[PDB]
């Protein structure tokens, strides 16, 4: 449909990436409901694409996302919270099978560092910021901010930042495992663009069970995650490109993955 | 009046609540008594309303040089279980406002999980970390094996577990188990002002975040997410998270009342 | 025993170390089941051997261990590998109580990485590689390499390794926790040999609760982990060995630990 | 205007949102269209202001016999992982207001796991509970392994999933499937009576009730009691958990007000 | 210590049952903070008493506990509950060591049914009822008792009973799994001193292993609370009373325990 | 050459695969000897391509009175540390044929736990469980404080194995320990009739259906229902689950080929 606060495209060779740009940079990015129901749109869309295999989230120069939106929360009420099932439909983004890379350019604070954690990969641009300020607000972090970042980053780190909602430069978050990549901001959304490529050449649900695997390791213990993996790794051989992909490495020629 | 530390009021007006471990002779190390009066002093600054953030430390060679071998030397396994040994030592982590660990020096064995058990932790320049348990035929028996080896990795956990071998100060951060690192002089003026950043925010907000955080040990993400998300809507209930947000959008300073 | 892929030594003080190294070069030391069925034969041996302590895993200089067989697995369907329990005995060396350093030189790729990753300590070498390269196979990691990797590197990381097949180097190993020291090529299994010295110089029993204790962190709840350790450390006060270096701290002199 | 349901708003000030699986010639079977339409008035339920509770019920026969087997029948595996095979089917999981299931008849595979997925089970005399997808060379898909192993123990789950065998009412109700037997005739009327009394009851208060007795099965008994506590602070920030204690005190009837 | 609301006893056989007795019928033994403060005083007594082995806990014939003081919760805020610790001294019941039975008589509601379920095993006298009827006073269990409760019921009794507040005979509990025995009303607590007295006479050190490992079969998997359990059953091998108990049966005679 | 044990293959084609312990001068206590044997006739009947359930039973008047006291008597702590005490025991949980325990007369210690290790339990009229460990001044060591609590109770499973009492067949079906009981002459025949059934459908399926419910106990919910899901997705690259599926559509009989 028409998109207000979003830009999408589908870049990348065989435009099998497909790129979504939040556009509402009078507020910095931030995360309205509006915002979010076109994001969500944007996503089941390139999720239903059968050309694309990767999604790269990202904002502008200036801001990836300030956080939710302040103006819009400032009349709720706990009960409007509870009834209205408030936020219910920002981690939306974690249901999509396909892989989402963040390119996170200038800040990346509240919902906004919590909308690239729920990405699965983190890519940031030399300016980039991360950081949850909730506490300055009166509030705590509410998609995940006290959850991912502390599991990516580590108790004190994380304590530190929640708790003072101190920035940290792109330098620390890579340090610290909350992004993996850092590139210059000029070549940020095409250096994502490049790894989201990679990715979309290999098997589709290949690589949705290898996402599905990896994110396991936070919701079981090391027994069963290796256990579920055992069954996907089994799963894969039910596929053909497995088949392919083996006997391309053996016959030492390049796999044609048919996402099947 | 205490024994084996040393307790004051510091920040901006009087905000921060510190605790200095004053056992040099034994290198800190954590006797029953020093404990005792640890776990009094952390209660009272938790009972103390000016008080929003507390901070933790020992002298400049050591923070703590780990449990008392010597009140440990005579027991048996059976005074450990039916006595209960060690029962008192994590009570820091009952403690609802933040606790930084100012760590100068060694921070070793109990020492080293003292620290860890507290909420951040920044390190002067010349800290070293370490679980020497191993080498006195024992293994850490507060927190050593569990929230070293969550911090920094199973490699670096069972490396210092097993050898007993001390990691640096920048061992410590590029690993995360520190967040900082200040020169031994300045760092516990340096924790000082992070627990007053803490202080002036609200308490009660304050305690709902950190206990947010400190779930993300304790469940799977999934449920992690979910509660945070419960303490999340909590904020809503208080004139704080109001305060917060309107001031936000009417462009101004919030104030903040603890409620 | 008499190997075809594997060679055994007994090295360091008192031959206290127990030395294993894939020895399949040809093969880069990709993880045939004959090797894996010595692998394990070795690891069962030095772990009855009393008078080993700790044991360490390596390769050849230029690989660790460059992945499974594929052409062992190019032929199976999905009902053999369920049926057939596929690599089922590849995660044996995590049912050794001693602790294992891998000495990881050159590639530890795909089945590579994770036996590594199995191994309690990783000691890298300057010209390390690590990779998950089994998406690039139409296959993902089936022997916790989206596992333990994630628990160790992050998600960001661990997701960027799994999907696209890359390799991190010694240093972003490190720096990310997945191994714990970088030596030169050279003096690698050299210093792998003191840190497994080291830990055999500490009492069997207690080491081995230690090691259990450490383990126990990626299967239970802090709460959990923090009550079994004490359990484990009560049951130190059961050894003589604790009574032992205890003494010999307050009495100013060297332990001596009978493993007992 | 659906086809296969039949939706009707019953109950005390037509408080409770009865929903009645109307497709008789398949048993019930659970089609994608059945689905569709059954999330469409438990959404709907959901969102009617006058509706405290949701009672789910299919025929005097069967409540349903299950997933449509015919069309799962040309499916691959590829089909359903890529397609995400069954994943319109626990939405009813993600409705907050109670939802209570009037099992006549049969309630055999997908039907057995819907009536697990609600929040109580009314059984009526004739009822049969089974997970027959062994049967079919499958096995249960929507929970069948897990809830009803949760709800009766490792030995009848194990004896009903490997072998296909169906219990009755009464089997179900000492297990703990199901918590009430009432009368083919009368089931449906004894559900409303019980939707009626929650629907009475605070919603909000009533959907964090539900919440905290749902997280029993994601958490230990430690992380659980402290989400559960949580919910009972907030609780505290609604009017009604004033109007009810101070009714209590006041030997009054409460007013609630769903705020 | 000089008791208002409860009356302590010490019972059985060498007077090894401590028994505790709420006694605050005209508030048909509300847990009133001053109630509370003096059953964990009582509680630590007989923890802490060498004579004792098992503390039986019960109420009036007309009611265990009805629970929590309401009139004490009323005039509470969200904040007050929260920066006061509200509710904190009530499982203070777990912290304890040796086993607790509940011996209840008539209501055990709310606060009282969860102080119930915080017991290790509960003997029912005929005429008890069990229920949380918080969710009529607008406020939902906070001790537990969506909790302890649904794990002991099932999820459906569990629901029924919270979100309505309807009340469960002696039997239903009793069929349910809640209760393990029910007596009649005049024998109950008797027969729960018999309970408390066979307790006691085993080794108190292992009886607090025993307990606290099936207490782990709600604080982790399968897998290891199975590692745990094996764990305990070890160190039972470093008391004396283990050494005790087992040749007794060998040398066909009475064990002599002596708790350690 | 088995000292301790019996194995016989029955039911229809010789698909169940019958274990019992052989051993009434001590009870079936077992004893090293005892279980070595127990896991090679296990292993046996696993890698047996004709047998696809197996039939643990012992003597009608024991199924196993516990662990073989008199080899425990001498042991250390370091003993069964360094030693891994009882390792060898839980090898029945390794086996993916589903085993189903005929438990006749007493089931103790060691001897209930080896049944609960089992899949499904059916118990003789006069079949007794109890953990008598805290008799012998020890506890149960092979999942009597974890199988049993999760199956009967925390107030049963304390009582259990803190007083060391017994529970009758009907206290233990009752309770969902077992979920069937026969009269102890037809019993064994009974539960063969049982591991018949699992015998006749496809054994890959059944394995996977296994482990499904086995997963009941070591994930929350949400893990278990997804992991749940992927096996289901499974069965849908097996040949099996299409003629099961095609069977019901064609009106006739499945016949599966465990494939
Ligand atoms: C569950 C949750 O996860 C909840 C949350 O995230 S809530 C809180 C998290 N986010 C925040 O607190 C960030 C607040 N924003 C800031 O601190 C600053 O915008 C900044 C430091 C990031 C940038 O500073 P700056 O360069 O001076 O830009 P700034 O003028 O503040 O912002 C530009 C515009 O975007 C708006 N904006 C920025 N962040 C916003 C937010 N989170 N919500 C709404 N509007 C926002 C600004 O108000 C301004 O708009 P107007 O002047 O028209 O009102
Ligand atoms: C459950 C648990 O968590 C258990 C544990 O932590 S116990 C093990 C952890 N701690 C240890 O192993 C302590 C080791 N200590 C040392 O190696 C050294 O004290 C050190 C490396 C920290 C510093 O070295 P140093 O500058 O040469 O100081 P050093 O002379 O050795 O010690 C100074 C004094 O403090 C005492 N001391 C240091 N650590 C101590 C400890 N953990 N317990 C008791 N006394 C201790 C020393 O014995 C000495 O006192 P005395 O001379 O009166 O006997
Ligand atoms: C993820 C999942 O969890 C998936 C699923 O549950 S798989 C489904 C599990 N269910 C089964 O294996 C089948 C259950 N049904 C039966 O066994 C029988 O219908 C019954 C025992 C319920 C009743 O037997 P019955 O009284 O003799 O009636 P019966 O003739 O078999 O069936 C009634 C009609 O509804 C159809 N029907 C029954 N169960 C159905 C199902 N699960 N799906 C689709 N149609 C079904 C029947 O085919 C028949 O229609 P037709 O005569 O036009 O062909
Ligand atoms: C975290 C938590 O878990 C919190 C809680 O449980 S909150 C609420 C749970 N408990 C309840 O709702 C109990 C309410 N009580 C009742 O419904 C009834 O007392 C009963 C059904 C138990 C018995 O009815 P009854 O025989 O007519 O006795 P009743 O007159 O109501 O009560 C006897 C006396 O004890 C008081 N009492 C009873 N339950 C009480 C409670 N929970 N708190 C405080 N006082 C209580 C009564 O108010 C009355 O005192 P007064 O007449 O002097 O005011
Ligand atoms: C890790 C673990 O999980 C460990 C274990 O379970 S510990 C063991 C738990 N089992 C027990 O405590 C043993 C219980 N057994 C007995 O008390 C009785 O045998 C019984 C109550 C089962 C039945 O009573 P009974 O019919 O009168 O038989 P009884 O005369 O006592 O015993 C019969 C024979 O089997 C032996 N026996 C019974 N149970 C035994 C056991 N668990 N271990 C070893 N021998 C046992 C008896 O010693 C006797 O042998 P001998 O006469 O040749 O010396």
């Given at each position: 449909?028409?998109?207000?606060?979003?830009?999408?495209?589908?870049?990348?060779?065989?435009?099998?990436?497909?790129?979504?740009?939040?556009?509402?940079?009078?507020?910095?990015?931030?995360?309205?409901?509006?915002?979010?129901?076109?994001?969500?749109?944007?996503?089941?869309?390139?999720?239903?694409?059968?050309?694309?295999?990767?999604?790269?989230?990202?904002?502008?120069?200036?801001a990836?996302?300030?956080?939710?939106?302040?103006?819009?929360?400032?009349?709720?009420?706990?009960?409007?919270?509870?009834?209205?099932?408030?936020?219910?439909?920002?981690?939306?983004?974690?249901?999509?099978?396909?892989?989402?890379?963040?390119?996170?350019?200038?800040?990346?604070?509240?919902?906004?560092?919590?909308?690239?954690?729920?990405?699965?990969?983190?890519?940031?641009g030399?300016?980039?910021?991360?950081?949850?300020?909730?506490?300055?607000?009166?509030?705590?972090?509410?998609?995940?901010?006290?959850?991912?970042?502390?599991?990516?980053?580590?108790?004190?780190?994380?304590?530190?930042?929640?708790?003072?909602?101190?920035?940290?430069?792109?330098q620390?978050?890579?340090?610290?495992?909350?992004?993996?990549?850092?590139?210059?901001?000029?070549?940020?959304?095409?250096?994502?663009?490049?790894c989201?490529?990679?990715?979309?050449?290999?098997?589709?649900?290949?690589?949705?069970?290898?996402?599905?695997?990896?994110?396991?390791?936070?919701?079981?213990?090391?027994?069963?995650?290796?256990?579920?993996?055992?069954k996907?790794?089994?799963?894969?051989?039910?596929?053909?490109?497995?088949?392919?992909?083996?006997?391309?490495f053996?016959?030492?020629?390049?796999?044609?993955?048919?996402?099947?």
């Amino acid at each position: 449909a028409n998109f207000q606060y979003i830009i999408t495209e589908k870049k990348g060779k065989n435009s099998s990436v497909g790129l979504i740009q939040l556009n509402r940079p009078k507020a910095l990015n931030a995360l309205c409901n509006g915002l979010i129901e076109e994001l969500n749109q944007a996503l089941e869309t390139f999720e239903e694409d059968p050309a694309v295999g990767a999604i790269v989230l990202t904002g502008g120069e200036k801001a990836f996302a300030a956080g939710a939106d302040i103006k819009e929360m400032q009349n709720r009420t706990f009960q409007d919270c509870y009834s209205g099932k408030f936020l219910s439909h920002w981690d939306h983004i974690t249901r999509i099978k396909k892989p989402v890379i963040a390119a996170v350019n200038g800040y990346a604070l509240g919902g906004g560092c919590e909308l690239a954690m729920m990405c699965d990969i983190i890519y940031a641009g030399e300016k980039a910021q991360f950081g949850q300020p909730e506490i300055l607000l009166g509030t705590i972090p509410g998609a995940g901010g006290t959850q991912r970042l502390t599991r990516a980053v580590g108790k004190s780190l994380a304590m530190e930042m929640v708790l003072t909602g101190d920035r940290i430069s792109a330098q620390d978050a890579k340090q610290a495992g909350l992004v993996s990549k850092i590139f210059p901001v000029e070549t940020l959304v095409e250096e994502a663009i490049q790894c989201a490529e990679k990715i979309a050449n290999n098997s589709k649900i290949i690589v949705a069970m290898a996402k599905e695997s990896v994110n396991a390791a936070f919701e079981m213990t090391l027994t069963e995650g290796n256990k579920l993996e055992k069954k996907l790794f089994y799963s894969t051989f039910a596929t053909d490109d497995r088949r392919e992909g083996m006997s391309a490495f053996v016959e030492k020629r390049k796999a044609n993955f048919k996402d099947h």
